[PDB]
Amino acid sequence: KILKRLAAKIKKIL
């Protein structure tokens, strides 16, 4: 799923 992947992108931005 892309749930944690989002949070990883969110970890990149944030």
UniProtKB/Swiss-Prot annotation:
Effect on the protein upon substituting L6K: Loss of antimicrobial and mast cell degranulating activities. Mastoparan-17; loss of antimicrobial and mast cell degranulating activity
Modified residues annotated as Leucine amide in this record: L14
Applications (biotechnology): The potent mast cell activator mastoparan-7 (abbreviated Mas7 or M7, which contains Ala at position 12 (K12A) and an Ile at position 13 (L13I)) can be used as a mucosal adjuvant to produce an anti-cocaine vaccine to induce an immune response that could attenuate the effects of cocaine consumption in humans. In mice, this preparation induces the production of high-quality neutralizing antibodies, reduces cocaine penetration of the blood-brain barrier and protects mice from its psychoactive effects.
Main location: secreted
Consequence when changing L6I: Important decrease in mast cell degranulating activity and no change in antimicrobial activity (S.aureus)
One GO process term, biological-process aspect: killing of cells of another organism
Tissue specificity statement from the Swiss-Prot or TrEMBL entry: Expressed by the venom gland.
Subcellular location: Secreted; Target cell membrane
Keywords: Amidation, Antibiotic, Antimicrobial, Cytolysis, Fungicide, G-protein coupled receptor impairing toxin, Immunity, Innate immunity, Mast cell degranulation, Membrane, Secreted, Target cell membrane, Target membrane, Toxin
InterPro entries the record matches: Mastoparan
Any one Pfam family match given in the protein's UniProt record, by short name: Mastoparan
GO cellular component term of the entry, any: extracellular region
Role played: Antimicrobial and mast cell degranulating peptide that interacts with lipid bilayers and activates G-protein coupled receptors. Shows antimicrobial activity against some Gram-positive bacteria (S.aureus MIC=5 uM), Gram-negative bacteria (E.coli (MIC=50 uM), S.enterica), and fungi (B.cinerea (MIC=8 uM), C.albicans (MIC=25 uM), C.albicans, C.glabrata, and C.neoformans). Does not show antimicrobial activity against Gram-positive S.mutans.
Note: Mast-MO, a derivative peptide with an extended N-terminus (the FLPII motif is N-terminally added) has antimicrobial and immunomodulatory properties. It exhibits increased antibacterial properties comparable to standard-of-care antibiotics both in vitro and in vivo, and potentiates the activity of different classes of antibiotics. This derivative targets bacteria, and rapidly permeabilizes their outer membrane. In vivo, it displays direct antimicrobial activity, leads to enhance ability to attract leukocytes to the infection site, and is able to control inflammation.
Similarity comment: family membership: Belongs to the MCD family. Mastoparan subfamily.
Name the record gives this protein: Mastoparan-L
Organism: Vespula lewisii
